[PDB]
Amino acid sequence: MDVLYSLSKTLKDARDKIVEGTLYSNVSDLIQQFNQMIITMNGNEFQTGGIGNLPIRNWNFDFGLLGTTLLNLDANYVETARNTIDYFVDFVDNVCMDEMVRESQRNGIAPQSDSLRKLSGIKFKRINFDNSSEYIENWNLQNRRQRTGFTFHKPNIFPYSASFTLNRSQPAHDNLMGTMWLNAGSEIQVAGFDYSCAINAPANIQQFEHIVQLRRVLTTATITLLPDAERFSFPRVINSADGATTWYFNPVILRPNNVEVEFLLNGQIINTYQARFGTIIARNFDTIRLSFQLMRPPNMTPAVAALFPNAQPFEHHATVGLTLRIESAVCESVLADASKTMLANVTSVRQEYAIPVGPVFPPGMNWTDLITNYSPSREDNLQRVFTVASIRSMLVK
Amino acid sequence: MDVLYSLSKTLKDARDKIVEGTLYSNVSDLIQQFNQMIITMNGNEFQTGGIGNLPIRNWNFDFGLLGTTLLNLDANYVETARNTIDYFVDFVDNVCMDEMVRESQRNGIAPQSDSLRKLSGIKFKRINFDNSSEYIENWNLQNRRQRTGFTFHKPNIFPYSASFTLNRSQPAHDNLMGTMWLNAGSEIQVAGFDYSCAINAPANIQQFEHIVQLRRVLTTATITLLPDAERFSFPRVINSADGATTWYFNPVILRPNNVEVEFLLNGQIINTYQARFGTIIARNFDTIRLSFQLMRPPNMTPAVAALFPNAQPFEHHATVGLTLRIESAVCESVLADASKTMLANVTSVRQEYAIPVGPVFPPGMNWTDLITNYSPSREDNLQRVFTVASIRSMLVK
Amino acid sequence: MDVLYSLSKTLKDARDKIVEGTLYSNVSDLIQQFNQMIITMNGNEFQTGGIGNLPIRNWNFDFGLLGTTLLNLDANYVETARNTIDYFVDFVDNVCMDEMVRESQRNGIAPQSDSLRKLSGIKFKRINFDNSSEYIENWNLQNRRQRTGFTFHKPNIFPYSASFTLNRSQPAHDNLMGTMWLNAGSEIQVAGFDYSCAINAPANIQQFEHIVQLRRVLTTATITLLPDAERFSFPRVINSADGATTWYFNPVILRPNNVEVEFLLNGQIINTYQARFGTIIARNFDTIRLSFQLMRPPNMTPAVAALFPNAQPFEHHATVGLTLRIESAVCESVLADASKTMLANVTSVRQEYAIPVGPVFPPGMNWTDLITNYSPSREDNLQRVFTVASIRSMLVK
Amino acid sequence: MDVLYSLSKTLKDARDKIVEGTLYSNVSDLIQQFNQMIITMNGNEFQTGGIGNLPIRNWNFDFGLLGTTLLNLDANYVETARNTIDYFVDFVDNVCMDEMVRESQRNGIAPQSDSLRKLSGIKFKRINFDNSSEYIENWNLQNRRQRTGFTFHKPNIFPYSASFTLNRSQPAHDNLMGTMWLNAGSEIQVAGFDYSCAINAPANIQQFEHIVQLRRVLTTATITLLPDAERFSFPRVINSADGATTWYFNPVILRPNNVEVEFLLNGQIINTYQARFGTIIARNFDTIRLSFQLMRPPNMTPAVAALFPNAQPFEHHATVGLTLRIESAVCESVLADASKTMLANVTSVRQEYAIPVGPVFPPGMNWTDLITNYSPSREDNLQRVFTVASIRSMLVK
Amino acid sequence: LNLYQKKMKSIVEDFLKRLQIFDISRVPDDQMYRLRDRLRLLPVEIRRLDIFNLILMNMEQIERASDKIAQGVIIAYRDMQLERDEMYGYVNIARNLDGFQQINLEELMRTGDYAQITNMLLNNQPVALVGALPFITDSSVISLVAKLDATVFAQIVKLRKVDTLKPILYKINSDSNDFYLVANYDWVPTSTTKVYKQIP
Ligand SMILES: [Zn+2]
Ligand SMILES: [Zn+2]
């Protein structure tokens, strides 16, 4: 595997540092590495493809070295080189793709394809070099069993979930109390509603709570917390819990009272914030708990008083809410986020070549399904597959 | 051109690796490259500026070189060097800016300025070196007529468009049916409304559809699709299509029924998703088609039934919607996005120096106007201009 | 690729300049080139076919050189040569065909087949020669990214489109006003009709306009423009816009008034002609706009007056029209035209070998579909495929 | 002049036969010719442009000859060559264009531009070679005085002419007899009409005749002759001869009787065809005479009899016609046709550079005006200008 | 160092010899060359390498720094104004080519002549010659008047060579030149030619 990596940084730092002009001395250290490769390869034979709509292609090697002679580089030098690179590019592409499709339950971590299995061979190890590409960097550290870690912008930790829970309801759905939410990606919006505006509630306050359990721990998270859930601030006609009928939600929004956000790790409070809106840091957590209340306004102007009668019908439904967004965070496990193309690359190659559903990944590499049941096997396969996608993107985008 | 590039990575890898103390043998390979330059330059005269409020500064070359000698670097060594760098910096800045304003209908892809035209000369090619900066990387691969590609978080593919289409309307605007939307940047929000709540519609279902045609194909797109269009979930007073009067929109939101998103390429469905909210992948498309329906609730509690009478006046307007956001994608053409400063750099330099409107770009480099009529000439000029902005940002931010 | 080219001009200039008689001296320069080939080939092994109904064939090389001895040429010399040529002919045919079927989205420009991919190899480049064949000529100039260009007689730029637009209509379709047209290939015919003969129109003149947007710019176009649209000068029964009924068109033709043809490029008028019929030149345009009017005759003999009453029924329908034909033009992109057999060759080879529909080209290489959505990928594939067809036609027709 | 020619075939056979990989000996004979040029040139300086919007650029020569690195060229060899070619290309373009705009009444058959006048100088003749380009081929043969000759597809010999001649008419235009036609390009359509259907005509037959005089003799013409003039087979409202009113034409078509086509040369019948439709050959003619008759049907079914009463009003107008198209022909004088781009090239260069109207050519190089008054001066200038356009198209399209 | 000559054996021979162990000669030819083939593909002990990089950077400077030999000459068949420099006094030096073709003597000589130069000289055209070259100083005020500098050249063609191409300079100082009936008459130096030796 690491082998694979090199193959690319070789080509990149190649198709990059080798051009009509420059001095030999700037590539001397490079040129070498290169040749070294050609050698190890030549003589060997390969095979890629064979699954689904993926073409089968065989490759052989028999190439000349490089003129370690000149003081500068003449156009002619390049072209005779670029011609050799292009065969490797078109190669690697086919190599990546071929191993970017196969999955495996037992050992979903190690190589699969006839192409790569052959590379992990010892006789090729004579090629590793410059592993500064964030992903491979972490691939190694994990082999040696040590503390890994990646960086994500608007990570994708929450499987899509949009629902409600009626804590007080009745057939007519004319005096409900409960919460409704949307957990998706890196965002959570939750609203607590009480049709009665806490008219008969102790201290005229109704307590609400929303708990979200992450499938993986996030550390170093920069988070935006804002009062109100705009998504649940407008009139709605919703299906009843049993699907037998529809209820009416006509919200009027009040400020959430006694807001408390807790970021817990294994049941322990790691970070807690009381009514702090804006930017907050959650340094290590696997669970978020949002507690907030609706407090009936003790003093009301006529217009307000008119919305909240002492007796039904309750026509304006008191609602309080919160919005929480994880802007960035670090995770020890690979995840999809709003910036990296890994998930999209893997999903795209599989879709383009009509790769059949396998035993590990959900149909279509569906993110929600994947993160909902993020088993060790899915994670090992995902990491292998994401690391390969990242190796491929160094040359082919 | 590529020439230009070097000039910088030269200086950066210079103003960076040349510090009081470091061991020589870390820069041996570097030092060289440097000198090589000075030589090729010395004996040449340049001129930049001359347009709008851009000064016309003149430059000459005549410099000594650098001892190669010394195990480690002594402070004195640096300062005598930094003094030489600063003249090149202040130079390049003026060089970039001068070629970052001129546009040419004809060959808007070729060099313009007297300054650069002179660089593409052969006698200067002896300076090229280390082309790994994502942009130049793609500049080459294109000049050779090959497959390019870039990376964008929240790309800016949709020209601003905020409007509506009334499929059923009448003078009083008291029983409308149609859609309203906002396409902007990487996001689309669209709502379908039916004042009658499909009371007389076949199967009590009203079909809606929203089609958006991209000006450039996006591949590898990671997309968030969510039900509801919050932007169109509140009461509005809107101007009529003819601008003669104003209508009232008083939405009540229902879940979009039979949601189907199609990502098409040249009329062909490449990806299709049925009612799948959350994160989805669209691997290659030039068009997005969102189809969704409003289905009159077959069972209604009294509160709901009251909103939807059998006869007018229709006072609560049934609305269903969708929100789609392209988090990341790859495009073969340069585009503005939410992270890169290229567009802002080009636009800013032109604004600061009062550069007159030219024949290629819309006034103020207006993004909406640019992407709406993204001609080949505008794209070639944009790419040239974006690549220069990226070369400049390696040294001057 | 260029490699391929040679292979042929080699054979042509061979099966042509080598015959029972002539002097050595006329081929000396040639003979050489030839041998040079045999060498480079011998030892190598190939494979063509394997897709659809295309036979798989393997080829090996082990041939003797040529007697560079003799003065004149004796019959015997030829026959021993022709025998060697025939193996190459039957070869190339199979090579062309094999690469004339495969398509590819990502890189639809470069080679596909195992046969050709091997040719682009460096070790064969030792064969290029005499690239005066118009197509290869342009293939190169495009690699070096420069101004290309082809020549066409009755080009095929307009996708088939035959329709109408009723600007004034009513259920009975007894007093219509609008236009009907046929855009196909290199021709446009458009008619403007007004059942009322502009009886209530300002200045008794009805304005018409027909705009056609080319998918590619045409330069240097020689065009025939004639008044009248014969195709729309006869009685017709046509389907209504909604397909629910049929209307009657009973034209009577008048000369088009204030004819103005504009050939625009990116919205700018490049050429404009006012009422000029016959041969006109449009030097560079991507759009054609034809504007013409129907002017009610101010003076009418009884027979004419009788056709145009002050009140309905309107039984004779005043019609004015134009016919425009692009006889020849130059395009920077390959196109089908009325003389070249490229499209037909590619389409024919695919049909004969039952080649399955691929990811790039429309089913059956349908021209209208192709030109309607002439994407960059379709054009690159079309050019590759057209260039190969042209290489093949040098030997096999 | 001939000089000029070479300059190109030099470059073409150059930018063509000189590629990465061809054996030296395939260009030995060529290389030479090339160098020979450089020599003769270097030293002398030139001026192009200096008219309308045409730029005045100054060209100077200072080039090193061509090496000969043995055994097939190395990439490097090419690039150092291509760099030299590109200066000549960009040169010739400017040379052609500069002499492609100047006209002269007195001697408008010789070189005008300061650029070319200098080339006809003796010290340059040393370059001329391979005069196989059809146009130059004929340029020479004319300088010596001999049988020239060009080849055209759908030649453009007929100036646009669309009119009628009423042989019998009256104010009401209710009983007309005459002909109407369209002569344009290579086609003629003519119809003979008799509102009375020869009711009072001798032998119930009305004779018609249409004569067209070519401005230049056409030889070897392949012609399509078909009965009927579709263009004049539909109802029309036409302006009267004096423009004071409009008449009604309501044709009903009968087969033309006793059709006789004569192709005359200086008043002598060279070819004559009696009622022969399809493909006919006219080997040498300057005039075409079409004679045809309308013969009242001696036997008529009721439906037919009803169209042709013994007394006015005559409501169905008996019409007979012919269509003649010159598919191909040879002319001793240059002409525009449906395949060659010469006229379009000359017209386009003049339009692009805003070249002022001169003393020889009609405004806009209008074809109809040109061929209508095709004076010796216009022809000599046209030939010079067409020959230059053809030299230019060998390199720049 | 573009020494497209020795490279093969030359170095190899010395190499082996110093190794002592074996007596070259009986080293099959496929051996000695193959030995190079392998040698040429290795780094270079920083020491070694580090120095060459240094020599090359100053190479140019040395060459023009010498007292004998300058780089090429120019011919313009245009009465030209002699320049003046504190050190040489009144001389015809040019510190820069630019405006006249360049002809790599080395290239010409090594590859035979096609007279490209022969024609340019004959129809008398502005041209330059580049590389290292012989040299001649002269004090004969008169000389200049006699236009000697435009002579030497014709030569080359007859001999097909160009070694015998000593060009001329006029170290005309207001002194050591017995020939000074010059500043006594209103006048200005008309040198038809000058040279590249940059100033020390
Ligand atoms: Zn963002
Ligand atoms: Zn035709």
Q: What is the DSSP string of B328-368?
A: EEEESS---BSS--HHHHHHHHHHHTTPPP-SSSPGGG-HH
Measured distance CA(C221)–CA(C330) in Å, rounded? 7
Residue A77 C-alpha, separation from nearest chain D C-alpha, in angstroms: 8
φ and ψ at D87, to 5 degrees?
Answer: -80, -30
Query: Which sign does the torsion angle of CA B80, B86, B92, B94 carry?
Result: negative
Q: How was this structure determined?
A: cryo-EM
Measured distance CA(D314)–CA(D252) in Å, rounded? 12
Distances (CA, A) of A263 to A260, A324, C231: 10, 12, 77
The one-character DSSP state at C55 is P
Element (H, E) at E59: helix E46-65
Do C120 and A83 lie within an 8 Å CB cutoff? Answer: yes
Around A267, how many Cα atoms within 13 Å sit in the side-chain half-sphere?
0
What does the DSSP assignment read for D262-312? EEEETTEEEEEEES--EEEEEEEEEEEEEEEEEE--SS--HHHHTTS-SSS
Residue B307 C-alpha, separation from nearest chain C C-alpha, in angstroms: 36
Distances (CA, A) of A297 to A197, A305, A312, C23: 9, 9, 18, 113
Selected for mutation to probe chain A from B222, B307, B325 (highest A CB count within 10 Å) is: B222
Ligand 2 centre and the CA of D154: distance in Å?
Answer: 6
Chain A residues inside the 8 Å CB shell of C122: 80, 83-84
Element (H, E) at D260: strand D257-265
Could you tell me the maximum CA-CA distance found in chain E, to the nearest angstrom? 78
Burial of E82 per CB tally in 10 Å (0-12, 13-18, 19+):
middle
Residue C143 contacts B, CB cutoff 8 Å: yes
| Bond prior to B111 in cis (omega within 30° of 0) | no
Measured distance CA(A39)–CA(A63) in Å, rounded? 8
Ligand 2 centre and the CA of D158: distance in Å?
Answer: 16
Measured distance CA(C189)–CA(C126) in Å, rounded? 53
Using an 8 Å Cβ cutoff, are D11 and D36 in contact? Answer: no
Chain D residues inside the 8 Å CB shell of C324: none
Residue D14 C-alpha, separation from nearest chain A C-alpha, in angstroms: 19
Residue D359 contacts E, CB cutoff 8 Å: no
Do D74 and A75 lie within an 8 Å CB cutoff? Answer: no
Measured distance CA(A262)–CA(A361) in Å, rounded? 33
Selected for mutation to probe chain C from A87, A89, A395, A397 (highest C CB count within 10 Å) is: A87
Non-local (6+) Cβ contacts of A144 within 8 A are none
Q: Which of C106, C145, C375 sits opposite B145 (nearest CB)?
A: C145
Q: End-to-end CA distance of chain E, in Å?
A: 25
Do C121 and A83 lie within an 8 Å CB cutoff? Answer: yes
Using an 8 Å Cβ cutoff, are C318 and C293 in contact? Answer: no
Question: C247-278 in b/e burial notation, b at 16+ Cβ within 10 A?
Answer: bebbbbbbbbbebbbbbbbeeeebbebeebbb
Neighbours of chain A (3+ CB pairs under 8 A): B, C, D, E
Taking phi over 0 as left and psi of -120 to 50 as alpha, with beta for the rest, D154 belongs to left
Chain A: residue nearest D76 by CA? A76
Q: Which of E40, E42, E43 sits opposite A69 (nearest CB)?
A: E40
* CB neighbours of residue C104 within 10 Å: 17
Selected for mutation to probe chain B from A13, A17, A19 (highest B CB count within 10 Å) is: A19
Distance, CA of E100 to chain centre: 17
- Identify the CA nearest to A60 among candidates C182, C118, B261: C118
Around E179, how many Cα atoms within 13 Å sit in the side-chain half-sphere?
12
Do D19 and C33 lie within an 8 Å CB cutoff? Answer: no
> Looking up tokens 């090629």, which residue turns up?
A127
Do C142 and B145 lie within an 8 Å CB cutoff? Answer: yes
Around E184, how many Cα atoms within 13 Å sit in the side-chain half-sphere?
5
Non-local (6+) Cβ contacts of A186 within 8 A are A154, A155, A156, A157, A158, A325, A326, A327, A337, A338
- Identify the CA nearest to D362 among candidates D353, D370, D374, D352: D370
Residue C333 contacts D, CB cutoff 8 Å: no
Non-local (6+) Cβ contacts of C3 within 8 A are C119, C120, C124, C125, C127, C128
The 3-class secondary structure across C305-349, one letter per residue, is HCCCCCCCCCCCEEEEEEEEEEEEEEECCCCCECCCCHHHHHHHH
Non-local (6+) Cβ contacts of D384 within 8 A are D99, D108, D109
Tokens coding C343: 């499209």
Ligand 2 centre and the CA of C328: distance in Å?
Answer: 9
Do A74 and D77 lie within an 8 Å CB cutoff? Answer: no
Chain E residues inside the 8 Å CB shell of D35: 114, 116
Residue B170 C-alpha, separation from nearest chain A C-alpha, in angstroms: 25
Burial of B79 per CB tally in 10 Å (0-12, 13-18, 19+):
exposed
Using an 8 Å Cβ cutoff, are E166 and E195 in contact? Answer: no
Residue D236 contacts C, CB cutoff 8 Å: yes
Do D39 and E101 lie within an 8 Å CB cutoff? Answer: no
Element (H, E) at D45: strand D45-47
Distance, CA of E154 to chain centre: 18
Do E125 and D35 lie within an 8 Å CB cutoff? Answer: no
Ligand 2 centre and the CA of C335: distance in Å?
Answer: 16
Distance, CA of B357 to chain centre: 21
Non-local (6+) Cβ contacts of E44 within 8 A are none
Q: Which of C114, C120, C122 sits opposite A80 (nearest CB)?
A: C122
Residue A67 contacts D, CB cutoff 8 Å: no
Measured distance CA(A206)–CA(B265) in Å, rounded? 52
Query: Which sign does the torsion angle of CA A336, A338, A343, A347 carry?
Result: positive
- Helices H / strands E in chain E, number of each: 7, 8
Q: End-to-end CA distance of chain A, in Å?
A: 20
Residue E57 contacts B, CB cutoff 8 Å: yes
Residue A83 C-alpha, separation from nearest chain D C-alpha, in angstroms: 12
Do D79 and A80 lie within an 8 Å CB cutoff? Answer: no
Strands A268-274 vs A257-265: parallel, antiparallel or unpaired: antiparallel
Using an 8 Å Cβ cutoff, are C219 and C330 in contact? Answer: yes
Measured distance CA(C105)–CA(A235) in Å, rounded? 47
Measured distance CA(D195)–CA(D319) in Å, rounded? 8
**Any contact of E with B, at least 3 CB pairs below 8 A?**
yes
Element (H, E) at A288: strand A278-295
> Looking up tokens 């965002």, which residue turns up?
A187
Chain D residues inside the 8 Å CB shell of A75: 75-76, 79
Chain D: residue nearest A20 by CA? D76
Annotated binding site of D for Ca(2+): 266, 286
Around D213, how many Cα atoms within 13 Å sit in the side-chain half-sphere?
6
Chain A: residue nearest E57 by CA? A71
**Any contact of C with E, at least 3 CB pairs below 8 A?**
no
Using an 8 Å Cβ cutoff, are D49 and D94 in contact? Answer: yes
Measured distance CA(B86)–CA(B95) in Å, rounded? 14
Chain D: residue nearest A83 by CA? D75
> Looking up tokens 């198709």, which residue turns up?
A15
Residue D90 contacts A, CB cutoff 8 Å: no
φ and ψ at D116, to 5 degrees?
Answer: -70, -45
